[PDB]
């Protein structure tokens, strides 16, 4: 499924993920495509900070959702 | 040049653009200012749907023109 990650500089990155993926995995995909180290990433969805060991399904993130990335 | 983008909820947004800008760029400016994802945006001017790779000049959009923004159905 496609999701959008909006950064604070007005760049939005699109990622292809599965609900079963962990937050740690998502962060690794973002590092791979934009080079940001996972330790600098804070991911926010529906006002919750996402935790590394949970999966996207844990948070009910559905296709075409937008997560916010704060560094 | 200033252009107006009228949405279906009666909100009009003003943008500063150049005729040389592409439609893709315009959509990115709208995302930046109102948060709507480009993939949900359908831009209409003089009864044409605007295509991403063309520029505003391609369509003869002059200053103070109004484009209409229709949003693709929610989700995908
Ligand atoms: S909208 C950015 C842009 C304009 C134009 C000069 C047509 N381009 O080649 C890019 C895509 C860089
Ligand atoms: S821009 C003219 C146009 C718009 C749309 C309804 C997408 N069309 O099918 C044509 C190409 C007629």
UniProtKB/Swiss-Prot annotation, chain B:
Residues with Phosphoserine modification: 65
Effect of substituting residue 74 to K: No effect on ADP-ribosylation
- On this chain, the residues bearing (Microbial infection) ADP-ribosylthreonine are 66
Where does the record say this protein resides? Cytoplasm; Nucleus; Mitochondrion outer membrane
Q: Where is this cross-link: Glycyl lysine isopeptide (Gly-Lys) (interchain with K-? in acceptor proteins)?
A: 76
User: According to the UniProt record, what happens if one changes residue 76 to A?
Assistant: Loss of ADP-ribosylation. Impairs ubiquitination by CRL2(KLHDC3) E3 ligase complex. No effect on ubiquitination by CRL2(KLHDC10) E3 ligase complex
How does the record say this protein sits in the membrane? Peripheral membrane protein
Annotated Ubiquitin-like domain residues: 1-76
Q: Where is this site: Essential for function?
A: 68
**Superkingdom, according to UniProt?**
Eukaryota
Phenotype when changing residue 68 to G = Loss of DTX3L-mediated polyubiquitination of histone H3 and H4
According to its UniProt entry, what is the function of this protein?
Exists either covalently attached to another protein, or free (unanchored). When covalently bound, it is conjugated to target proteins via an isopeptide bond either as a monomer (monoubiquitin), a polymer linked via different Lys residues of the ubiquitin (polyubiquitin chains) or a linear polymer linked via the initiator Met of the ubiquitin (linear polyubiquitin chains).
Name of the protein in its database record: Ubiquitin
What is the originating organism of this protein? Answer: Homo sapiens
Q: Which gene encodes it?
A: UBC
Q: Which residues of the complete protein appear here?
A: 1 to 76 of 685
């Amino acid at each position: 499924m496609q999701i959008f990650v909006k950064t604070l500089t007005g760049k939005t990155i699109t990622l292809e993920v599965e609900p079963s993926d962990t937050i740690e995995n998502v962060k690794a995909k973002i590092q791979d495509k934009e080079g940001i180290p996972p330790d600098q990433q804070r991911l926010i969805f529906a006002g919750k900070q996402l935790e590394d060991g949970r999966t996207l399904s844990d948070y009910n993130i559905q296709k075409e959702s937008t997560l916010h990335l704060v560094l």
